[PDB]
Structures are given as structure tokens and as C-alpha cells.
Design a protein around this ligand. Structure first.
Ligand SMILES: CONC(=O)c1ccc(C)c(Nc2ncnn3cc(C(=O)N[C@@H](C)c4ccccc4)c(C)c23)c1
Ligand SMILES: CONC(=O)c1ccc(C)c(Nc2ncnn3cc(C(=O)N[C@@H](C)c4ccccc4)c(C)c23)c1
Length: 335
């Protein structure tokens, strides 16, 4: 039951989509907002860029589709449709992904108002709830930032672009930015702390100009690593570099986030720590007293087992293309 497709050029690529999707308008692969005539809702349509023109692209294409088909959670963007104008595998060269269109991203929100404490609580609670789910599937975001957190008029939130990375500087955990010690899923928690601070104050917590300046701003708040944490620094170059910097004492966060809910400050103290072994997890964060009004252990679900064995495979473009085609054809839209 192939739908009828129509073709158009939108500065300056070809978009070939089902007539179902009307009034495409660029918003960003490349992304367009559109009207889904079947449902009456606005959607975001992403055309993957050159999905099968290289092995890296082919594998990324498969990776993204597999992730989107598996993750089903209220705070994680969901796949509404996936299509190709191709009539067969032999003709398969383009892939389009469709999701709900949201109202605004967190960058837009902070630029336009001032958020009350309850508003912050609910947003952060939702981000952590989505992260608990994603992390439970052994997936991490790795590049969580205000631009990939989308909300709709009722403050209902969705996480986008997770599990793809394998401004960012402002929200990046130092252990990955500086490759200075082992890391775990809490790299995403550092990002949440930076985001939460920004929602609370209205300003970027650590707006560094480059990686060196970024570290400088971070250490001004958290304090230079000393003997204790230095014991865990595996990189000799990193140890040498750290010891070359002007030593800074840790700041009491309460003197920084003046006027903030003391519980918000306590939570930030637990997220913004350099030691990856000590940083709070998503699940632990949800249980923090700051979220007492929202927390419900019976409504913070985990993900069904996720098979990502494909990550360890080295296949040809046509092989990844065939696997992707299989997933496109087998797709069943959300009820
Ligand atoms: C696992 O990674 N794959 C993904 O997450 C993944 C995969 C496919 C897709 C189609 C998406 N969705 C989006 N991708 C890129 N930009 N974009 C922006 C919005 C949006 O709603 N903007 C609002 C504020 C807006 C509202 C009005 C106008 C303009 C913008 C959405 C929903 C997206 C994510
Ligand atoms: C990846 O491709 N490059 C390669 O070939 C390759 C291969 C092996 C290694 C060990 C690396 N090194 C890095 N890889 C990824 N991130 N990273 C971040 C930093 C950094 O900021 N160091 C700080 C402490 C610093 C700052 C100033 C001076 C000294 C150290 C470094 C040195 C890296 C790269």
C-alpha cells in the first residue's frame, strides 16, 4: 500500500515524501516541520544526509534507526514514521525519520522568560526520568545540551539525539572533554547539572571559549583536583597539566546560586563533581529530596533489553544498507 510521493526542493536538497505530509518548512541530516494530514498534528521530518555513501554513514544510519525503534518512553523522542521513496532494496538511497514537532527547546525557554523553582523541578525531573530509561538500555547521550531537550506548551519534555555521539563544550563532562580518567553513564549527569544551573540562574554556568578556558571556569567553581583525585588520573600528560595550573579552592555552591532552593543547590553539589566514581546517577538523582513532589518509583520505568551487538561488527555499505532496509519495512507505527 505504497503512498503517493511528491518531490520538491528546499534550499537546496530534494525532499520526496508522502502526500500525507504537507506544507514542509525548513527548521534546521536536514529537518523540516510539516503537517501530518493523517493525524492533524505537526511533525518534524529529518532527511538523513548521504546515509549510504560511506561505511561510517551507513552504520550511523542503522544505529539511529535501531535506537529510535526500540526506545519507548514519555521523555524520550519517539519515532512516528520512517520512510523511503525507494520501491526496492536496489533503489534504496534515502531515509526519512518522522517525530512529533515540539513547542520549544530549553535554550528558547531560558532566553524568553525566567523559570520558577517548581518549573525547574519538573523539567529536570523529566530529563532524569528519560535518562534513567536510556541508561538502563546501556545507552548514553554524551552530548546532552539545551538544544536537544524539547518541550511543549505544558512543559512536557523529550530528549533528542541520544546514543549518536560515540556549545557542546559548555555542557561536557570534563573526563570526556579532557580524557583524564575513566568515565561512565554519569557524563550525562554533569550535563544535567550544567543545564539545571542555567534554568535556575538564566545564564550559562561555564561558557568557555575553548577547552582550556572551559576547564578554567569549571575549576573556579569545583576546585582544582588535589592529591586525592590525582590518584585516579590515568593520563600522565593530564597529571602534569593539572599540576601546572593555579590552584583554586572549591566554592560553597550556596554562595554561588544565591536565592535558589537549598535542595536544588544540594543536588547540584552532587552532580557537579569531577570524580566520575562519586557523581550521582540518574536513578539516585530521582530519589533526591528536591524531586519529592514528582518522584514515584513505580512510574520511572526502565528499558526492555536492547541488542546492540551490531556495534562490534565491521560490514560493507551494502550490508548495513540491507539491514537498515529490513528495519524500515518492518516498522509498525505507534498505536
Ligand atoms: C536518536 O536521535 N534521533 C533523534 O532524536 C531524532 C530523529 C528524527 C527526528 C525528526 C528528531 N527530531 C528533531 N530533530 C531535529 N530537530 N528537531 C527540532 C524539533 C522540534 O520539535 N523543534 C521545535 C522546538 C520547533 C517548533 C516549531 C518550529 C521549529 C522547531 C524536533 C522534534 C527535531 C530527532
Ligand atoms: C583522538 O585522536 N587523537 C589521537 O590520535 C590520540 C591518541 C591518544 C591519546 C591519548 C589522545 N589524546 C586525547 N584524546 C581525546 N581527548 N583528549 C583530550 C585531551 C586533553 O585535553 N588533555 C589535557 C588533559 C591536556 C591539556 C593540555 C596539555 C596536555 C594535556 C587529550 C590529550 C586527548 C589522542
Amino acid at each position: 500500500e505504497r503512498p503517493t510521493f511528491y518531490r520538491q526542493e528546499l534550499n537546496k536538497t530534494i525532499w520526496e515524501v508522502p502526500e500525507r505530509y504537507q506544507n514542509l518548512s525548513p527548521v534546521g541530516g536536514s529537518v523540516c516541520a510539516a503537517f501530518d494530514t493523517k493525524t492533524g498534528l505537526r511533525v518534524a521530518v529529518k532527511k538523513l544526509s548521504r546515509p549510504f555513501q560511506s561505511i561510517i554513514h551507513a552504520k550511523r544510519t542503522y544505529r539511529e534507526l535501531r535506537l529510535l525503534k526500540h526506545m519507548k518512553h514519555e521523555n524520550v523522542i519517539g519515532l512516528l514514521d520512517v520512510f523511503t521513496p525507494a520501491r526496492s532494496l536496489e533503489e534504496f538511497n534515502d531515509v526519512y525519520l518522522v517525530t512529533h514537532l515540539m513547542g520549544a527547546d530549553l535554550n528558547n525557554i531560558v532566553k524568553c522568560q525566567k523559570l520558577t523553582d517548581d518549573h525547574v523541578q519538573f523539567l529536570i525531573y523529566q530529563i532524569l526520568r528519560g535518562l534513567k530509561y536510556i541508561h538502563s538500555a546501556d545507552i548514553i547521550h554524551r552530548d546532552l545540551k539545551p538544544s536537544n531537550l524539547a518541550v511543549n506548551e505544558d512543559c512536557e519534555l523529550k530528549i533528542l539525539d541520544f546514543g549518536l555521539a560515540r556549545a557542546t563544550r559548555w555542557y561536557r563532562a570534563p573526563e570526556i572533554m579532557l580524557n583524564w580518567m575513566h568515565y561512565n553513564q554519569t557524563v550525562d549527569i554533569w550535563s544535567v547539572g550544567c543545564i539545571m544551573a542555567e534554568l535556575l540562574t538564566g545564564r550559562t554556568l561555564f561558557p568557555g571559549t575553548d577547552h582550556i578556558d572551559q576547564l578554567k571556569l569549571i575549576l573556579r567553581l569545583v576546585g582544582t583536583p588535589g592529591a586525592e583525585l590525582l590518584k585516579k588520573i590515568s593520563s600522565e600528560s593530564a597529571r602534569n597539566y593539572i599540576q601546572s595550573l593555579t590552584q583554586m579552592p572549591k566554592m560553597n555552591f550556596a554562595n554561588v546560586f544565591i536565592g535558589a532552593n537549598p535542595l536544588a543547590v544540594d543536588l547540584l553539589e552532587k552532580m557537579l563533581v569531577l570524580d566520575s566514581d562519586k557523581r550521582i546517577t540518574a536513578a539516585q538523582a530521582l530519589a533526591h529530596a528536591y524531586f519529592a513532589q514528582y518522584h514515584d518509583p513505580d512510574d520511572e520505568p526502565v528499558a526492555d533489553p536492547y541488542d546492540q551487538s551490531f556495534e562490534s561488527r565491521d560490514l560493507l555499505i551494502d550490508e548495513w544498507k540491507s539491514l537498515t532496509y529490513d528495519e524500515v519495512i518492518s516498522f509498525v507505527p505507534p498505536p
